[PDB]
């Protein structure tokens, strides 16, 4: 069915490799329409072998929507919108993003999408996992769905760069991570536990252990119990795929309907990807 | 306190009350009965020490609470089909009856409303019964959690007690107090709401128990297990419980809709014998 | 079998009422020997109807061992060793001791025992629960016992009056609780997970959720998992008893082989008991 | 890297490797075989894309790893009792074979040492197999936790797969690939250590799986459940896993002692067919 690009789905759940296109060149309307369709169908799409410039990265990201950096990451000099996920070979700090999450959900309007490009990565190690929150939602019984669909969740960055972060002893390195204001870390926002994607109209479960503090209105014990069940459910191996990186692979993921995590199995090896983030609207039900 | 015809001594700040100043061998005037019924509705489990009543007076007093109807599983005393036994011979090595939190016979389309239990001969110590309030278990859920669960129903059956799950496992009750039952009666399912309204007080109570509840209707096995596990942990917190110690001729009534109870098995090697008459109820409803 | 006192066990597991003795008077050797035997047998013993003076309380406690206040509680004026568990009718703060624990196990040598006396208590509400850690230990399989008997646990007061306490929003009232130094709150000690009682020689499980931070040498996830199973096991209703208070009831509990908790079911009612604490040796295996 | 006769491309930093530069239709010289065996021991699961071998060459290549012996439950291809099928017709609505973390046939006194699996016809996408390293699951337990558990043994049986627990439940495998089995063979127990030493590498591996492990020997049901649940959660973290995608004529070998695997059921409605020969092992030991 695709005529302007070649798409090879990665699993029966999510993920697709796209080839037959050169992202260094402008895309005609037909080629862009297929790309966007593949992005909305497969949720995480990746293009091996795209030796693009940083400006081309920026422009390509702009096709998905307004570009706008996430609060915590350092950017390359000359490009505030091009942020780094960079780990030096000798680092001993915590690996960025090494549990399931989606990005910056403590924001009133988290990103819609992220476009990541491998600069220099290990021959093996440092895969990124993804999973579908559409599948997590769809595999809940209708009874379970009706039960939880009216709930909201309180999100904040407290464990990442607020008071809880300051409490613990593990730190990120300053290679890619900025020093942040503690109160900014502890500012709370509220999102729906079940969101409707604004383009596809499909529903997705929307919670993550990194930023979700509690179910709004619940006791700590009620909220901890529901959220724990939902995390176990959503992170079943069945709902995941695994993306392996090579130099100049460019990947886009939908930040509303997927979760992702870094795999820290390359200790002692240099790894560097850049990324631009695409702004989103307020998550809504 | 407000009581003028009976003396009531509440047992904890959550449920339970001792009632004295009354002789259950004699008939009760309307004034004394109304206060007893009121104390039953206010305290959920009430008990009357020192009541040396006959089996017939036990039956008659039970009847004041509602029609009397034995539960399926228990043997009864000779000459009194309505008076059933909770009896454990000293030597027994079988499972102790009722030794986890439950309420009685909820596999029935219409479980009992109440039970009236009377001590015949019990150990100097050991063999207390614990009780907890399902009004309190419900009221301490957040308004959010209440709204979340109030439309759910739960499938109950006796499969673990005298159905296929019972037949599959190794432990048994002795035949001292427990009849042989049909396996299909054991496996027969009924559905009740997760949250019920008491037909007299109008108050709401959480309604689930691990002995007879199989699953939340319409949910997957893992969803149901996970929610019911949380509710069991919530309702069985020590703060919601009271503990009743038995003495010969103590007579006790519990509300079988808004409480749970469990036997404490801490008297192995000692004889224990209580009788009970069960008072019938209506379909639990929302 | 008791000839100098009358003892009435409370449950088949632990607990005993003692009568037939006047604690306002000196005890002969025979009466004291029976008291101590009952204390070692039943683990928590209580004497209704003992209108004693504070000095008599102190002296009676001294028969069990050296007396020595616990760090957190305020004492009555004129008697540093007589501490208060006092809640005013109008209080809205956290109830002292409202989860299962044993006292001050963050100390290198926690108390051996505590002697508590009711001054003024509600007609109903404010029971104290107790449970036996001998029974908790004895109902573990031999295989489970051999598995865990070599483990140690790190204890500290951090959740009660150290950094974790400072983090949260709930506070105890200053009615009975002193302001404490944070570092004193966070000082760690190490005890055996399975201790041998120094008088009876019987073994007891020794862990509590209030002061135990983690199994020494374990990861956070391993330790949280074992300790959770042990707490669920030890706090089964089967292992508990419940003590109801009346004015001038004097009770002694063994602080090594039991746990206890306050029951907060008297909101809006005044409740006041005093207590002296009896010093112990370093818990050992 | 150190390899001079084969090209090996590791799959993740934990386990798994692709091997190219070799034609399994031809015999392997000692030098090429030694490197393959070494890569098997180093990477635990290895796979060879593009190997259009006959069933006989499949059998012969398997044999290089150890004596070949079919597992009890799977049907075999006509004319090759040692070559068993993992085959799912497009229309099937039965349970997917192997769809949770396990290692093969651990109810046996001596489970297989390895399996060699070959894709005949598989979906364009969907039907990957996941693998994880039980060396890594063991090595990431603290020294304290290791000392704690290293003396324990676990009781295994096939009761959930083709024993009484299977017969009691509702789901079934189809008869496409699965034989009817004797219920008593299903319920027969064996005991293995919780922590095993690999008989060639000498390295230690955690050894438990939820499909066949019933309980820690000597423990109570609640103790065993609670410890095994923790170990399952620990060993199945995403960080310890790799995922293999299948293509026609890919041939893959896994170590059945130091890994676990699971089928991913994400291809309903599509035909999938792999064959496999199982290589026999010795009693797992400490
Ligand atoms: C860029 C990105 O920022 C991060 C940074 C790190 C991150 O990964 C984790 C994983 N586990 C964590 C666990 C704890 Cl207890 C605390 C913090 C944790 N952080 C997730 C998102 C974002 O969101 O845009
Ligand atoms: C009279 C009464 O009958 C019983 C009998 C026993 C009973 O107690 C338990 C407790 N835990 C159990 C656990 C399992 Cl796996 C099986 C059976 C169990 N039975 C609860 C009710 C009733 O309801 O009228
Ligand atoms: C006198 C006594 O001091 C206390 C004071 C309070 C206490 O009770 C609790 C119960 N649950 C708690 C829960 C949390 Cl998260 C924190 C603190 C908690 N404290 C236990 C012991 C002692 O030990 O001698
Ligand atoms: C060939 C292989 O055979 C099987 C077949 C199926 C299998 O997969 C599962 C997964 N989860 C299961 C869960 C339950 Cl409750 C029951 C049976 C289950 N079976 C695991 C091994 C073997 O070992 O040789
Ligand atoms: O390094 C990775 O694979 C992903 C890190 C991540 O979570 C992120 O960039 O937001
Ligand atoms: O023996 C007891 O204390 C209670 C037994 C019980 O559960 C019952 O009679 O239903
Ligand atoms: O108030 C109570 O019943 C007990 C409080 C307590 O834990 C203590 O005094 O140590
Ligand atoms: O189908 C698969 O991917 C693996 C099935 C499996 O578990 C097995 O063959 O033992
Ligand atoms: Cl009647
Ligand atoms: Cl052979
Ligand atoms: Co991220
Ligand atoms: Co009962
Ligand atoms: Co205390
Ligand atoms: Co298998």
mmCIF file of C-alpha atoms in Angstrom, chain C:
data_model
loop_
_atom_site.group_PDB
_atom_site.id
_atom_site.type_symbol
_atom_site.label_atom_id
_atom_site.label_comp_id
_atom_site.label_asym_id
_atom_site.label_seq_id
_atom_site.Cartn_x
_atom_site.Cartn_y
_atom_site.Cartn_z
ATOM 1 C CA UNK C 1 0.276 -23.784 88.777
ATOM 2 C CA UNK C 2 0.668 -20.147 90.028
ATOM 3 C CA UNK C 3 0.252 -19.999 93.829
ATOM 4 C CA UNK C 4 1.111 -16.373 94.742
ATOM 5 C CA UNK C 5 -0.766 -14.594 91.887
ATOM 6 C CA UNK C 6 -3.813 -15.368 89.767
ATOM 7 C CA UNK C 7 -3.065 -15.457 86.025
ATOM 8 C CA UNK C 8 -5.673 -15.559 83.262
ATOM 9 C CA UNK C 9 -4.106 -15.911 79.743
ATOM 10 C CA UNK C 10 -5.716 -13.628 77.166
ATOM 11 C CA UNK C 11 -5.286 -15.739 73.960
ATOM 12 C CA UNK C 12 -3.534 -19.079 73.142
ATOM 13 C CA UNK C 13 -0.679 -17.050 71.659
ATOM 14 C CA UNK C 14 0.295 -14.302 74.168
ATOM 15 C CA UNK C 15 -1.112 -11.989 76.838
ATOM 16 C CA UNK C 16 -2.156 -12.534 80.457
ATOM 17 C CA UNK C 17 -4.175 -10.696 83.110
ATOM 18 C CA UNK C 18 -2.630 -10.871 86.591
ATOM 19 C CA UNK C 19 -4.694 -10.284 89.772
ATOM 20 C CA UNK C 20 -4.395 -11.246 93.463
ATOM 21 C CA UNK C 21 -1.525 -8.798 94.127
ATOM 22 C CA UNK C 22 -1.159 -5.268 95.258
ATOM 23 C CA UNK C 23 1.622 -3.420 93.422
ATOM 24 C CA UNK C 24 1.418 -0.647 96.019
ATOM 25 C CA UNK C 25 3.161 -3.058 98.448
ATOM 26 C CA UNK C 26 6.570 -4.772 98.324
ATOM 27 C CA UNK C 27 6.482 -8.203 96.666
ATOM 28 C CA UNK C 28 7.987 -11.181 98.477
ATOM 29 C CA UNK C 29 10.455 -13.314 96.516
ATOM 30 C CA UNK C 30 7.884 -15.952 95.701
ATOM 31 C CA UNK C 31 5.318 -13.433 94.340
ATOM 32 C CA UNK C 32 8.010 -11.688 92.270
ATOM 33 C CA UNK C 33 9.277 -15.030 90.866
ATOM 34 C CA UNK C 34 5.753 -15.833 89.642
ATOM 35 C CA UNK C 35 5.355 -12.406 88.114
ATOM 36 C CA UNK C 36 8.620 -12.730 86.230
ATOM 37 C CA UNK C 37 7.749 -16.262 85.120
ATOM 38 C CA UNK C 38 4.326 -15.015 83.843
ATOM 39 C CA UNK C 39 6.108 -12.135 82.032
ATOM 40 C CA UNK C 40 8.498 -14.554 80.330
ATOM 41 C CA UNK C 41 5.701 -16.994 79.474
ATOM 42 C CA UNK C 42 3.003 -14.646 78.284
ATOM 43 C CA UNK C 43 5.202 -11.783 76.974
ATOM 44 C CA UNK C 44 2.643 -9.082 77.806
ATOM 45 C CA UNK C 45 1.154 -9.022 81.244
ATOM 46 C CA UNK C 46 -1.322 -6.534 82.726
ATOM 47 C CA UNK C 47 -2.677 -5.814 86.259
ATOM 48 C CA UNK C 48 -6.044 -4.072 86.434
ATOM 49 C CA UNK C 49 -6.860 -1.814 89.417
ATOM 50 C CA UNK C 50 -3.371 -0.736 90.586
ATOM 51 C CA UNK C 51 -3.651 2.810 91.927
ATOM 52 C CA UNK C 52 0.067 3.312 92.271
ATOM 53 C CA UNK C 53 2.155 6.479 92.784
ATOM 54 C CA UNK C 54 4.706 7.483 90.127
ATOM 55 C CA UNK C 55 7.587 6.398 92.509
ATOM 56 C CA UNK C 56 5.950 2.984 92.930
ATOM 57 C CA UNK C 57 5.763 2.736 89.096
ATOM 58 C CA UNK C 58 9.375 3.538 88.894
ATOM 59 C CA UNK C 59 10.316 0.965 91.564
ATOM 60 C CA UNK C 60 8.168 -1.768 90.094
ATOM 61 C CA UNK C 61 9.751 -1.194 86.626
ATOM 62 C CA UNK C 62 13.218 -1.374 88.266
ATOM 63 C CA UNK C 63 12.508 -5.004 89.262
ATOM 64 C CA UNK C 64 12.606 -5.920 85.539
ATOM 65 C CA UNK C 65 15.915 -4.139 84.937
ATOM 66 C CA UNK C 66 17.657 -0.688 84.795
ATOM 67 C CA UNK C 67 15.177 2.129 83.882
ATOM 68 C CA UNK C 68 16.009 4.546 81.146
ATOM 69 C CA UNK C 69 13.735 6.836 79.098
ATOM 70 C CA UNK C 70 13.318 6.528 75.323
ATOM 71 C CA UNK C 71 14.722 9.466 73.298
ATOM 72 C CA UNK C 72 11.499 10.931 71.786
ATOM 73 C CA UNK C 73 8.888 11.277 74.579
ATOM 74 C CA UNK C 74 8.365 14.128 77.089
ATOM 75 C CA UNK C 75 8.378 13.221 80.756
ATOM 76 C CA UNK C 76 6.213 14.349 83.689
ATOM 77 C CA UNK C 77 7.713 17.176 85.762
ATOM 78 C CA UNK C 78 9.813 15.765 88.589
ATOM 79 C CA UNK C 79 10.300 12.407 86.913
ATOM 80 C CA UNK C 80 12.536 12.129 83.807
ATOM 81 C CA UNK C 81 11.998 8.337 83.765
ATOM 82 C CA UNK C 82 8.153 8.611 83.646
ATOM 83 C CA UNK C 83 7.239 9.481 80.036
ATOM 84 C CA UNK C 84 3.828 10.410 78.651
ATOM 85 C CA UNK C 85 1.589 9.010 75.946
ATOM 86 C CA UNK C 86 -0.907 11.795 76.058
ATOM 87 C CA UNK C 87 -3.353 12.974 73.367
ATOM 88 C CA UNK C 88 -5.596 16.023 74.043
ATOM 89 C CA UNK C 89 -9.247 15.719 72.969
ATOM 90 C CA UNK C 90 -8.858 18.350 70.327
ATOM 91 C CA UNK C 91 -5.692 16.957 68.589
ATOM 92 C CA UNK C 92 -5.568 16.459 64.781
ATOM 93 C CA UNK C 93 -1.982 15.270 64.453
ATOM 94 C CA UNK C 94 -0.745 11.723 63.781
ATOM 95 C CA UNK C 95 -1.468 9.170 66.576
ATOM 96 C CA UNK C 96 1.755 8.021 68.281
ATOM 97 C CA UNK C 97 2.631 4.395 67.476
ATOM 98 C CA UNK C 98 -0.296 3.690 65.161
ATOM 99 C CA UNK C 99 1.516 0.994 63.172
ATOM 100 C CA UNK C 100 3.150 -2.262 64.306
ATOM 101 C CA UNK C 101 6.553 -1.737 65.799
ATOM 102 C CA UNK C 102 8.693 -2.303 68.807
ATOM 103 C CA UNK C 103 10.177 0.646 70.667
ATOM 104 C CA UNK C 104 13.376 2.566 69.712
ATOM 105 C CA UNK C 105 15.074 -0.203 67.769
ATOM 106 C CA UNK C 106 17.272 2.462 66.123
ATOM 107 C CA UNK C 107 19.246 2.345 69.375
ATOM 108 C CA UNK C 108 22.307 0.120 69.602
ATOM 109 C CA UNK C 109 20.627 -1.351 72.640
ATOM 110 C CA UNK C 110 16.819 -0.873 72.437
ATOM 111 C CA UNK C 111 14.650 -1.284 75.563
ATOM 112 C CA UNK C 112 14.056 -4.719 76.987
ATOM 113 C CA UNK C 113 10.614 -3.851 78.270
ATOM 114 C CA UNK C 114 8.139 -1.061 78.908
ATOM 115 C CA UNK C 115 5.799 -0.559 81.843
ATOM 116 C CA UNK C 116 2.702 1.450 80.969
ATOM 117 C CA UNK C 117 0.037 2.678 83.345
ATOM 118 C CA UNK C 118 -3.331 4.173 82.401
ATOM 119 C CA UNK C 119 -3.933 7.586 83.996
ATOM 120 C CA UNK C 120 -7.131 8.622 82.240
ATOM 121 C CA UNK C 121 -8.538 6.802 79.224
ATOM 122 C CA UNK C 122 -11.896 6.706 77.224
ATOM 123 C CA UNK C 123 -14.663 4.361 78.281
ATOM 124 C CA UNK C 124 -13.980 2.651 74.885
ATOM 125 C CA UNK C 125 -11.463 3.187 72.077
ATOM 126 C CA UNK C 126 -7.654 3.394 72.334
ATOM 127 C CA UNK C 127 -6.883 -0.320 72.788
ATOM 128 C CA UNK C 128 -3.323 -1.413 72.235
ATOM 129 C CA UNK C 129 -2.602 -4.363 69.956
ATOM 130 C CA UNK C 130 0.286 -6.754 70.592
ATOM 131 C CA UNK C 131 1.682 -9.691 68.684
ATOM 132 C CA UNK C 132 4.293 -12.393 69.368
ATOM 133 C CA UNK C 133 7.543 -12.428 67.318
ATOM 134 C CA UNK C 134 8.226 -15.877 68.775
ATOM 135 C CA UNK C 135 5.110 -17.125 67.035
ATOM 136 C CA UNK C 136 6.118 -15.216 63.867
ATOM 137 C CA UNK C 137 9.482 -17.004 63.963
ATOM 138 C CA UNK C 138 8.111 -20.417 64.886
ATOM 139 C CA UNK C 139 5.545 -20.471 62.068
ATOM 140 C CA UNK C 140 8.289 -19.980 59.390
ATOM 141 C CA UNK C 141 9.218 -23.381 57.804
ATOM 142 C CA UNK C 142 12.615 -24.833 58.942
ATOM 143 C CA UNK C 143 13.748 -24.101 55.340
ATOM 144 C CA UNK C 144 12.714 -20.441 55.579
ATOM 145 C CA UNK C 145 14.335 -20.185 59.026
ATOM 146 C CA UNK C 146 17.725 -21.512 57.800
ATOM 147 C CA UNK C 147 17.466 -19.142 54.819
ATOM 148 C CA UNK C 148 17.157 -15.902 56.769
ATOM 149 C CA UNK C 149 18.832 -16.583 60.129
ATOM 150 C CA UNK C 150 22.242 -15.136 59.151
ATOM 151 C CA UNK C 151 20.814 -11.818 57.924
ATOM 152 C CA UNK C 152 21.187 -8.404 59.678
ATOM 153 C CA UNK C 153 19.000 -5.349 59.285
ATOM 154 C CA UNK C 154 19.848 -1.664 59.306
ATOM 155 C CA UNK C 155 17.589 0.375 61.644
ATOM 156 C CA UNK C 156 17.277 4.145 62.067
ATOM 157 C CA UNK C 157 14.797 6.753 63.181
ATOM 158 C CA UNK C 158 14.753 8.571 59.854
ATOM 159 C CA UNK C 159 10.940 8.232 59.320
ATOM 160 C CA UNK C 160 10.185 9.132 62.906
ATOM 161 C CA UNK C 161 12.380 12.179 63.540
ATOM 162 C CA UNK C 162 15.122 12.238 60.871
ATOM 163 C CA UNK C 163 15.233 13.356 57.183
ATOM 164 C CA UNK C 164 12.226 11.339 55.936
ATOM 165 C CA UNK C 165 10.172 12.788 58.828
ATOM 166 C CA UNK C 166 11.278 16.320 57.869
ATOM 167 C CA UNK C 167 10.294 15.572 54.242
ATOM 168 C CA UNK C 168 6.646 14.584 54.946
ATOM 169 C CA UNK C 169 3.749 16.844 55.946
ATOM 170 C CA UNK C 170 2.150 14.961 58.867
ATOM 171 C CA UNK C 171 3.579 15.841 62.311
ATOM 172 C CA UNK C 172 3.179 14.533 65.819
ATOM 173 C CA UNK C 173 1.874 17.080 68.282
ATOM 174 C CA UNK C 174 4.186 18.505 70.908
ATOM 175 C CA UNK C 175 1.911 17.143 73.660
ATOM 176 C CA UNK C 176 4.131 14.077 74.250
ATOM 177 C CA UNK C 177 6.780 14.312 71.516
ATOM 178 C CA UNK C 178 10.075 16.321 71.815
ATOM 179 C CA UNK C 179 11.768 18.251 69.009
ATOM 180 C CA UNK C 180 14.744 16.048 67.931
ATOM 181 C CA UNK C 181 18.101 16.529 66.128
ATOM 182 C CA UNK C 182 17.857 15.356 62.451
ATOM 183 C CA UNK C 183 21.236 13.560 62.453
ATOM 184 C CA UNK C 184 20.289 11.730 65.595
ATOM 185 C CA UNK C 185 17.159 10.726 63.579
ATOM 186 C CA UNK C 186 19.342 9.433 60.728
ATOM 187 C CA UNK C 187 22.001 7.561 62.734
ATOM 188 C CA UNK C 188 21.991 3.897 61.665
ATOM 189 C CA UNK C 189 22.553 0.777 63.748
ATOM 190 C CA UNK C 190 22.563 -2.884 62.756
ATOM 191 C CA UNK C 191 20.698 -5.735 64.428
ATOM 192 C CA UNK C 192 20.215 -9.464 63.708
ATOM 193 C CA UNK C 193 17.037 -10.328 61.808
ATOM 194 C CA UNK C 194 16.530 -13.303 64.222
ATOM 195 C CA UNK C 195 17.448 -12.689 67.858
ATOM 196 C CA UNK C 196 17.703 -15.041 70.875
ATOM 197 C CA UNK C 197 15.922 -13.752 73.965
ATOM 198 C CA UNK C 198 18.633 -13.358 76.669
ATOM 199 C CA UNK C 199 16.487 -14.856 79.451
ATOM 200 C CA UNK C 200 14.225 -17.411 77.880
ATOM 201 C CA UNK C 201 16.702 -18.525 75.148
ATOM 202 C CA UNK C 202 13.787 -18.622 72.688
ATOM 203 C CA UNK C 203 14.232 -17.140 69.199
ATOM 204 C CA UNK C 204 12.260 -14.272 67.727
ATOM 205 C CA UNK C 205 11.915 -12.562 64.411
ATOM 206 C CA UNK C 206 13.167 -9.024 64.778
ATOM 207 C CA UNK C 207 12.041 -6.494 62.223
ATOM 208 C CA UNK C 208 9.557 -3.650 62.124
ATOM 209 C CA UNK C 209 8.419 -1.260 59.400
ATOM 210 C CA UNK C 210 8.842 1.881 61.544
ATOM 211 C CA UNK C 211 12.642 1.690 62.028
ATOM 212 C CA UNK C 212 13.965 -1.033 59.673
ATOM 213 C CA UNK C 213 15.478 0.588 56.597
ATOM 214 C CA UNK C 214 16.856 -2.436 54.763
ATOM 215 C CA UNK C 215 18.475 -5.850 54.941
ATOM 216 C CA UNK C 216 22.176 -5.222 55.303
ATOM 217 C CA UNK C 217 24.115 -5.991 52.073
ATOM 218 C CA UNK C 218 20.914 -6.452 49.965
ATOM 219 C CA UNK C 219 19.705 -4.187 47.090
ATOM 220 C CA UNK C 220 16.771 -1.961 47.833
ATOM 221 C CA UNK C 221 14.474 -4.193 45.751
ATOM 222 C CA UNK C 222 15.676 -7.473 47.381
ATOM 223 C CA UNK C 223 15.395 -6.059 50.861
ATOM 224 C CA UNK C 224 11.994 -4.420 50.304
ATOM 225 C CA UNK C 225 10.652 -7.761 49.015
ATOM 226 C CA UNK C 226 11.853 -9.974 51.936
ATOM 227 C CA UNK C 227 10.903 -7.442 54.619
ATOM 228 C CA UNK C 228 7.414 -7.045 53.080
ATOM 229 C CA UNK C 229 6.822 -10.751 53.201
ATOM 230 C CA UNK C 230 8.040 -10.866 56.807
ATOM 231 C CA UNK C 231 5.781 -7.954 57.899
ATOM 232 C CA UNK C 232 2.708 -9.618 56.269
ATOM 233 C CA UNK C 233 3.618 -12.901 57.926
ATOM 234 C CA UNK C 234 4.255 -11.482 61.413
ATOM 235 C CA UNK C 235 1.190 -9.304 61.520
ATOM 236 C CA UNK C 236 -1.338 -12.004 60.744
ATOM 237 C CA UNK C 237 -4.427 -11.538 62.998
ATOM 238 C CA UNK C 238 -3.784 -15.027 64.370
ATOM 239 C CA UNK C 239 -0.610 -13.845 66.158
ATOM 240 C CA UNK C 240 -2.153 -10.794 67.893
ATOM 241 C CA UNK C 241 -4.074 -9.974 71.021
ATOM 242 C CA UNK C 242 -5.845 -6.836 71.972
ATOM 243 C CA UNK C 243 -5.567 -5.043 75.307
ATOM 244 C CA UNK C 244 -8.322 -2.748 76.472
ATOM 245 C CA UNK C 245 -7.350 -0.021 79.025
ATOM 246 C CA UNK C 246 -9.103 1.152 82.270
ATOM 247 C CA UNK C 247 -7.792 3.684 84.779
ATOM 248 C CA UNK C 248 -4.795 2.324 86.764
ATOM 249 C CA UNK C 249 -4.209 -0.745 84.643
ATOM 250 C CA UNK C 250 -0.432 -1.377 84.661
ATOM 251 C CA UNK C 251 0.958 -3.442 81.822
ATOM 252 C CA UNK C 252 4.428 -4.684 80.995
ATOM 253 C CA UNK C 253 5.460 -5.848 77.523
ATOM 254 C CA UNK C 254 8.659 -7.496 76.365
ATOM 255 C CA UNK C 255 10.157 -5.102 73.838
ATOM 256 C CA UNK C 256 12.363 -7.726 72.177
ATOM 257 C CA UNK C 257 9.862 -10.557 71.382
ATOM 258 C CA UNK C 258 6.618 -8.605 70.802
ATOM 259 C CA UNK C 259 5.369 -5.789 68.564
ATOM 260 C CA UNK C 260 2.589 -3.434 69.428
ATOM 261 C CA UNK C 261 0.469 -0.673 67.925
ATOM 262 C CA UNK C 262 -1.935 2.049 69.096
ATOM 263 C CA UNK C 263 -5.474 1.911 67.762
ATOM 264 C CA UNK C 264 -6.620 5.499 66.852
ATOM 265 C CA UNK C 265 -10.391 4.879 67.268
ATOM 266 C CA UNK C 266 -11.021 7.569 69.880
ATOM 267 C CA UNK C 267 -10.663 10.826 67.872
ATOM 268 C CA UNK C 268 -11.929 13.709 70.038
ATOM 269 C CA UNK C 269 -11.430 11.931 73.361
ATOM 270 C CA UNK C 270 -8.612 12.664 75.913
ATOM 271 C CA UNK C 271 -6.230 9.734 76.532
ATOM 272 C CA UNK C 272 -3.295 9.670 78.861
ATOM 273 C CA UNK C 273 -0.980 6.843 79.988
ATOM 274 C CA UNK C 274 2.486 7.108 81.550
ATOM 275 C CA UNK C 275 5.301 4.733 80.977
ATOM 276 C CA UNK C 276 8.786 3.821 82.211
ATOM 277 C CA UNK C 277 11.160 1.961 79.940
ATOM 278 C CA UNK C 278 13.556 -0.786 80.989
ATOM 279 C CA UNK C 279 17.014 -0.832 79.391
ATOM 280 C CA UNK C 280 18.179 -3.778 77.341
ATOM 281 C CA UNK C 281 21.422 -5.331 76.053
ATOM 282 C CA UNK C 282 22.473 -5.311 72.390
ATOM 283 C CA UNK C 283 20.035 -7.616 70.469
ATOM 284 C CA UNK C 284 21.995 -10.761 69.554
ATOM 285 C CA UNK C 285 21.478 -13.972 67.611
#
